[PDB]
Design an enzyme around this catalytic site. Structure first.
Site, PDB file in Angstrom:
ATOM      1  N   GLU A 282     -14.227  -8.772  56.142  1.00 37.27           N
ATOM      2  CA  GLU A 282     -13.695  -9.176  54.845  1.00 37.27           C
ATOM      3  C   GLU A 282     -12.753 -10.368  54.990  1.00 37.27           C
ATOM      4  OE1 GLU A 282     -10.382  -7.341  53.313  1.00 37.27           O
ATOM      5  OE2 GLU A 282     -10.629  -8.063  51.280  1.00 37.27           O
TER       6      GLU A 282
ATOM      7  N   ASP B  42       2.111  -4.526  60.667  1.00 35.94           N
ATOM      8  CA  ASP B  42       1.058  -5.248  61.380  1.00 35.94           C
ATOM      9  C   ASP B  42       0.882  -4.826  62.836  1.00 35.94           C
ATOM     10  OD1 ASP B  42      -0.796  -7.435  60.500  1.00 35.94           O
ATOM     11  OD2 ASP B  42      -0.031  -8.425  62.306  1.00 35.94           O
TER      12      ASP B  42
ATOM     13  N   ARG C 103     -24.748  -6.473  48.744  1.00 34.14           N
ATOM     14  CA  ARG C 103     -24.004  -5.228  48.601  1.00 34.14           C
ATOM     15  C   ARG C 103     -23.865  -4.991  47.110  1.00 34.14           C
ATOM     16  NH1 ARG C 103     -17.928  -4.945  50.688  1.00 34.14           N
ATOM     17  NH2 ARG C 103     -17.795  -6.665  49.168  1.00 34.14           N
TER      18      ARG C 103
ATOM     19  N   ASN D 251     -16.258  -6.673  44.029  1.00 35.37           N
ATOM     20  CA  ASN D 251     -15.957  -5.620  44.996  1.00 35.37           C
ATOM     21  C   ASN D 251     -14.835  -4.765  44.429  1.00 35.37           C
ATOM     22  OD1 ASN D 251     -13.599  -7.110  45.389  1.00 35.37           O
ATOM     23  ND2 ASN D 251     -13.749  -7.108  47.633  1.00 35.37           N
TER      24      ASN D 251
ATOM     25  N   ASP E 276     -11.852  -4.473  57.252  1.00 35.80           N
ATOM     26  CA  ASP E 276     -10.783  -4.748  56.304  1.00 35.80           C
ATOM     27  C   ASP E 276      -9.813  -5.816  56.806  1.00 35.80           C
ATOM     28  OD1 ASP E 276      -9.075  -3.964  53.904  1.00 35.80           O
ATOM     29  OD2 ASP E 276      -7.694  -3.515  55.565  1.00 35.80           O
TER      30      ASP E 276
ATOM     31  N   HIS F  54      -6.470 -11.478  58.494  1.00 35.27           N
ATOM     32  CA  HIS F  54      -5.160 -11.219  59.075  1.00 35.27           C
ATOM     33  C   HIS F  54      -5.164 -10.792  60.535  1.00 35.27           C
ATOM     34  CE1 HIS F  54      -3.531 -11.945  55.144  1.00 35.27           C
ATOM     35  NE2 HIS F  54      -4.489 -11.176  54.657  1.00 35.27           N
TER      36      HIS F  54
HETATM   37 CA   LIG Z   1      -2.258  -9.029  61.522  1.00 34.33          CA
HETATM   38 CL   LIG Z   2     -15.164  -6.529  50.703  1.00 36.62          CL
END
Ligand SMILES: [Ca+2]
Ligand SMILES: [Cl-]
Length: 496
Positions: free
Chosen positions: A233, A167, A337, A298, A197, A201
């Site tokens: 996302e 990370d 999409r 997806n 992406d 997180h």
């Molecule tokens: Ca992170």
């Molecule tokens: Cl996605």
């Protein structure tokens, strides 16, 4: 970051999953442009880890080694060549930016990377960037394993390793800058936006700080002041402390509720039925339409990978899949999409596809080119859903009716529905176990219209079904419950 930056009049982007730059470049000039597609989401263009066990899994591209534009899709020359050629014909390129992490902490040190760069995950050493131990959250994460253990804890979901993935310390200006550096490289090359992406997180603020360092789009193709299109996302089906709305400040957000619900409905599971789709959109608990990035499936969930469920419809369920995509493309909600995949040797062990890791069609690791059969379909195991007439014509349908309001809705209380878009289009669906034969108000001007699902308008005639809208805007529709494609669509440009 809310503006798609697509050419005047194009409303959809297609995901050419794992496709090579040269093929995309060609795909833009020969098909995407004249077919009205707005842009292409490309697999990560930055150098990733070469994982040989299993053999070159698609997910290795989600494990960065550096920001060198060198992958199985091509090198930097090819990437630049692709962006330029696509922009020159009005087709945009959107980069899948993997910026939350580098590779797995357990990956062996060495040069097993798509561009040969050296890297040592164990020592947090990525000199090709360069990143060192000081650039990861090892000391910020408070979990015992160092990985994300409980999504009920918003902090660890942001500061700990996603399934072991190192990370990045996005709180540091240095890391934020190295990333901005990469993204500006892409923007200056001609990129129109990014798929961010693992947005869940990263703190909404770190992402922002990163975006604040980006250039305006290339002024050779985009108007002054143009900012990159941003769709993050974030998988939020409710129940988590983190909400999709937490990212509205940075741009659009992926609406994973969309595909999950549409799939359950089209499959007619859990008591759902198409007649319920009359209030489709926010009325179903979805985020605001002006922030939603919608899609049926997806690259992840079409495989059950961290998927939204078994309700997800994919090319494997072609008939129902086309209805799902058709409905989405016709409904005004969100930014659409379209998926485009490759066929992999799916094999089950009772609800277990042990081949979900398989990478794109290849020869000893070298991604196969995309061959085009005469019937416009693709060879070498590339599905190419975006070329299926029913989906391709619905992509144009969305363009044609763009801006028109959802109206003239009809439902039979079960699974036979129909609705239009102002006075520019009308679509009809029969998902019941009997025939749908009825005269409906289309809201379209009188005339003969080509059904763009069954056929195409060519030389003042139709190759498929013809619909006759009388003076009062009404027309008869007859869709058998056993039709291969149980839906019909017509619009202002399909009229003779
Ligand atoms: Ca992170
Ligand atoms: Cl996605």
């Amino acid at each position: 970051q809310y503006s798609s930056n697509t050419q005047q009049g194009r409303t959809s982007i297609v995901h050419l999953f794992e496709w090579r730059w040269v093929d995309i470049a060609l795909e833009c000039e020969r098909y995407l442009a004249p077919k009205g597609f707005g842009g292409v989401q490309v697999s990560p263009p930055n150098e990733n880890v070469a994982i040989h066990n299993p053999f070159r899994p698609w997910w290795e591209r989600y494990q960065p080694v550096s920001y060198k534009l060198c992958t199985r899709s091509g090198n930097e020359d090819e990437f630049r060549n692709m962006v330029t050629r696509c922009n020159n014909v009005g087709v945009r390129i959107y980069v899948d930016a993997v910026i939350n992490h580098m590779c797995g902490n357990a990956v062996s040190a060495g040069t097993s990377s798509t561009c040969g760069s050296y890297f040592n995950p164990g020592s947090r050493d990525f000199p090709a960037v360069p990143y060192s131990g000081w650039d990861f959250n090892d000391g910020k994460c408070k979990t015992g394993s160092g990985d994300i253990e409980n999504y009920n804890d918003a902090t660890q979901v942001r500061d700990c390793r996603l399934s072991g993935l190192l990370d990045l310390a996005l709180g540091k200006d240095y890391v934020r800058s190295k990333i901005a550096e990469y993204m500006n490289h892409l923007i200056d090359i001609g990129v129109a936006g990014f798929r961010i992406d693992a947005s869940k997180h990263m703190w909404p603020g770190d992402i922002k700080a990163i975006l604040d360092k980006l250039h305006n789009l290339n002024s050779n193709w985009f108007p002054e002041g143009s900012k990159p299109f941003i769709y993050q996302e974030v998988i939020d089906l409710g129940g988590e402390p983190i909400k999709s709305s937490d990212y509205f400040g940075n741009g659009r957000v992926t609406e994973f509720k969309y595909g999950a619900k549409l799939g359950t409905v089209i499959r007619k599971w859990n008591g759902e039925k198409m007649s319920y789709l009359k209030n489709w959109g926010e009325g179903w608990g979805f985020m605001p339409s002006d922030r939603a990035l919608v899609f049926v499936d997806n690259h992840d969930n079409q495989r059950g990978h961290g998927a939204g469920g078994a309700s997800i419809l994919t090319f494997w369920d072609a008939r129902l899949y086309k209805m799902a995509v058709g409905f989405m493309l016709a409904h005004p909600y969100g930014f659409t999409r379209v998926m485009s995949s490759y066929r992999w040797p799916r094999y089950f062990e009772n609800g277990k596809d042990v081949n979900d890791w398989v990478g794109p069609p290849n020869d000893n690791g070298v991604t196969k080119e995309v061959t085009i059969n005469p019937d416009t379909t693709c060879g070498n195991d590339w599905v190419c859903e975006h070329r299926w007439r029913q989906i391709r014509n619905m992509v144009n349908f969305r363009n044609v009716v763009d801006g028109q309001p959802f109206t003239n809705w009809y439902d039979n209380g079960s699974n036979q529905v129909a609705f239009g878009r102002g006075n520019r289009g009308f679509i009809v669906f029969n998902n019941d176990d009997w025939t749908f034969s009825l005269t409906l108000q289309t809201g379209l001007p009188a005339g003969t219209y080509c059904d763009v699902i069954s056929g195409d308008k060519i030389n003042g005639n139709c190759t498929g079904i013809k619909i006759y809208v009388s003076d009062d805007g009404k027309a008869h529709f007859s869709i058998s419950n056993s039709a291969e494609d149980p839906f019909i669509a017509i619009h202002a440009e399909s009229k003779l």
